[PDB]
């Protein structure tokens, strides 16, 4: 009497992360008539995007937080459910997955939800240079101090720029950024000592190098004008690129057997499916390019594959008349 069992609250899909890719997935899933839950912790990467520069249909000064509010409202309108919480763990239970969510930043509860499918859409977050007063960084990060080169390189064209990079591998970006502007000063923020070979290459390109810790970003109305270092060095710059790496929001999947990883990223096929038949991965979490358009299309593909699977397993709806 296996099929005799009372049906448990089992979602068709749970979308982990309510950002660009996750909300796209949620819109599609709900419009496929599927029961889906979006879990969103708040204050993610796209929330700090002040100007989405390059997305068909949207003005290039649209902030990410406005897209999130718009798309969350659309997802709910079509029938998706939203839970504000922090995903802690995903466990494989065979025909379903179990998702533990931390609800409440303090005095937290840990409800567990069951689902046929999981869409991992939790993305990443860029590391920022750490100053005693982080608000001085936040006043410029995402405005004129950029974290993405393909997003904002055009808006840096031929300006005096700082590249903030903590490793020689991260300093390598100077030799890509120079496409947009040759006027690059490299700042390591006291994080690593640059070797002789790289110092010589930077010098041959004319990119000044300063290794002392940054103490203050100068500017007004979110438009940087320069940078001060703890050793007294002061420089002029109207823009910059932070290339200090990222934190990947993937901890809740590290226990899943049968998942193929590429470093911290998940490897997917052409429908955004991982090697696990019940797990999809979108956007910044999957191996590939990190853009809004890419994440949104991933959500489309994942939701469509899930609908195809569920539809194909269902009984036909007949017309009685």
Annotated binding-site residues for FAD read 20-21, 41, 43, 46, 53-54, 86-87, 151, 284, 292
Looking at the DSSP bridge assignments, the partners of residue 286 are 266
The partner in contact with residue 113, picked from a copy of itself, ligand FAD, none with C-beta cut-offs of 5 to 8 angstroms by kind, is none
Spatial separation of the C-alpha atoms in residues 204 and 169, rounded to whole Å: 18
Token output for 91: 């466990």
Closer residue to a copy of itself in complex, CB, 149/213: 149
Annotated binding site: 20-21, 41, 43, 46, 53-54, 86-87, 151, 284, 292
Binding to a copy of itself, residues 255-274 (CB under 8 A): 270
Q: Which residues of 189-221 are buried (b: 16+ CB within 10 A; e: fewer)?
A: bbbeebeeeebeebeeeebebbbebbbbbebee
Token output for 102: 């931390």
Task: Tell me, residue by residue from 49 to 88, as one string, x for binding to a copy of itself by CB under 8 A and - for no binding.
Answer: ---xxxxxxx-x-x----x--xx--x---x----------
9 binds a copy of itself (CB under 8 A): no
Q: Single out the residue of 50, 181, 215, 275 in contact with a copy of itself (rule: CB under 8 A).
A: 181
The partner in contact with residue 182, picked from a copy of itself, ligand FAD, none with C-beta cut-offs of 5 to 8 angstroms by kind, is a copy of itself
Contacts to ligand FAD by CB under 6 A: 16-22, 39-46, 48-49, 52-54, 64, 84-87, 102, 104-105, 121-123, 125-126, 128, 138, 141-142, 147-148, 151, 249, 282-285, 290-293, 295
The least CB distance from residue 122 to a copy of itself, in Å, is: 17
The partner in contact with residue 290, picked from a copy of itself, ligand FAD, none with C-beta cut-offs of 5 to 8 angstroms by kind, is ligand FAD
117 binds a copy of itself (CB under 8 A): no
Look at residues 224, 220, 222, 252 and name the one whose alpha carbon lies nearest to residue 238: 224
Token output for 172: 């390598």
∠ Cα 64 23 57 (to 5°): 55
């Amino acid at each position: 009497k296996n099929l005799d069992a009372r049906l448990d609250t089992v979602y068709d899909a749970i979308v982990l992360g309510g950002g660009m890719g996750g909300l796209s997935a949620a819109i599609y899933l709900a419009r496929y008539g599927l029961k889906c839950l979006v879990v969103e912790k708040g204050r993610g990467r796209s929330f700090w995007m002040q100007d989405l520069r390059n997305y068909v249909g949207l003005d290039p000064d649209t902030p990410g937080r406005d897209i999130i509010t718009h798309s969350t409202q659309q997802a709910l309108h079509w029938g998706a459910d939203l839970l504000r919480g922090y995903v802690e763990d995903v466990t494989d239970e065979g025909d379903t997955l179990a998702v533990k969510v931390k609800v409440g930043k303090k005095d937290s509860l840990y409800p567990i939800f069951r689902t046929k499918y999981v869409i991992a859409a939790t993305g990443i977050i860029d590391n920022l240079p750490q100053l005693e007063d982080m608000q001085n960084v936040y006043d410029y990060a995402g405005y004129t101090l950029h974290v993405c080169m393909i997003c904002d390189g055009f808006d840096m064209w031929d300006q005096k720029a700082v590249l903030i990079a903590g490793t020689e591998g991260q300093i390598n970006a100077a030799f890509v950024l120079n496409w947009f502007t040759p006027y690059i000063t490299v700042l390591t923020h006291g994080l690593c000592t640059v070797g002789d070979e790289m110092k010589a290459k930077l010098a041959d390109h004319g990119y000044p190098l300063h290794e002392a810790a940054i103490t203050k970003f100068l500017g007004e109305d979110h438009k940087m004008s320069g940078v001060e270092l703890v050793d007294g060095t002061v420089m002029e710059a109207t823009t910059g690129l932070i290339n200090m790496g990222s934190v990947y929001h993937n901890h809740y999947l590290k226990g899943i057997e049968g998942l193929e990883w590429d470093g911290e990223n998940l490897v997917t096929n052409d429908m955004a499916q991982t090697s696990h038949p019940r797990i999809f991965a979108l956007g910044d979490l999957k191996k590939g390019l990190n853009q809004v358009s890419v994440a949104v299309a991933d959500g489309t593909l994942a939701a469509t594959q899930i609908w195809r699977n569920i539809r194909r397993a269902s009984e036909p709806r007949k017309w009685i008349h």
